């Protein structure tokens, strides 16, 4: 029971609420992919 | 070897005592493994607060060897 986040390609359960997900959002993988998406948007302009 | 952990301190206005006598106050910018601390808008505190206090420069760096105690006056 989980939904894969498009950013980091990793799995996120809906029942773990937010405060656990913050650890996944502040990790190096997810934050890095967050930046790379934004960089793609930078380069599309 | 290990970097000192100032990570919560940076960008906060901080007072720190240079050697025995002196006390410098400035907004912490960066730091290194020797605790060399570079800060901006430095001011040298003295007995008379508005009077004898005189600013140093736009950017000042401090040798970690002369650092005694570092207090942040800030959140």
């Amino acid at each position: 029971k989980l939904q894969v986040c498009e950013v980091c390609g990793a799995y996120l359960s809906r029942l773990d609420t937010d405060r656990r997900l913050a650890d996944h959002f502040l990790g190096k993988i997810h934050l890095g992919y967050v930046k790379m998406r934004e960089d793609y948007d930078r380069l599309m302009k | 070897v290990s970097t000192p952990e100032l990570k919560k301190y940076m960008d906060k206005k901080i007072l720190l005592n240079i050697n025995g006598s002196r006390k410098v106050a400035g907004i912490l910018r960066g730091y290194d493994i020797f605790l060399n601390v570079v800060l901006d808008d430095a001011m040298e505190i003295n007995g008379e607060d508005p009077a004898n206090n005189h600013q140093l420069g736009l950017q000042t760096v401090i040798r970690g060897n002369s650092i005694i105690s570092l207090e942040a006056l800030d959140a």
Partner: protein, 184 residues
């Protein structure tokens, strides 16, 4: 290197400030260590001093002066009795440890500055620390701004009368039997 945590007895490989900081803050390590110092602390009270005895030769004078004095009877409880009474005494000490009479906080509950002092979260000295003392709260109030304008009359069927002073369980038969006046 490797960091051996001797409280948990479990190794952690290639010590680093991050992983070691995470382990030390960990809940399991927390319980293990706290319990460890609970035992090491209960021991010094548990351990009997057992100081050494030095027996000298009783003199001829005090043997004669102490012989005319009659021998006193000693009382010794049964094993089944002494186990229970030791349990009771220890549980009484644990009670006197946790008492900490707060009644002053109950007296001033409706004072105009009660929110700035006795709430202790919103104070100055201890106020800012409690925030960082809040647990990480992983998964699953009395604001300071109050004024006297709330609760203008402290008594409108609101308050409970002050709790009666306590009494020792042993000597509870010491109490004067009857009150002087008729309460409802």
């Amino acid at each position: 290197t490797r960091y051996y945590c001797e409280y948990c007895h479990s190794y952690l490989t290639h010590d680093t400030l991050s992983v070691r900081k995470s382990h030390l803050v960990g809940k399991n390590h927390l319980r293990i260590t706290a319990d460890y110092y609970r035992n090491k602390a209960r021991d010094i009270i548990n351990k009997h001093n057992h100081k050494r005895r030095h027996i000298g030769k009783r003199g001829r004078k005090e043997r004669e002066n102490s012989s005319q004095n009659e021998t006193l009877k000693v009382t010794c409880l049964s094993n089944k009795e002494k186990r229970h009474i030791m349990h009771v005494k220890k549980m009484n000490q644990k009670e006197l440890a946790q008492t900490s009479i707060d009644t002053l906080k109950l007296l001033y509950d409706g004072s105009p500055g009660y929110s700035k002092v006795f709430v202790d979260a919103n104070r100055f000295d201890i106020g800012d620390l409690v925030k960082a003392s809040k647990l990480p709260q992983r998964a699953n109030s009395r604001s300071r701004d109050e004024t006297c304008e709330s609760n203008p009359f402290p008594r409108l069927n609101n308050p409970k009368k002050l709790e009666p002073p306590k009494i020792l369980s042993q000597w509870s038969n010491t109490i004067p039997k009857t009150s002087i006046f008729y309460s409802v």
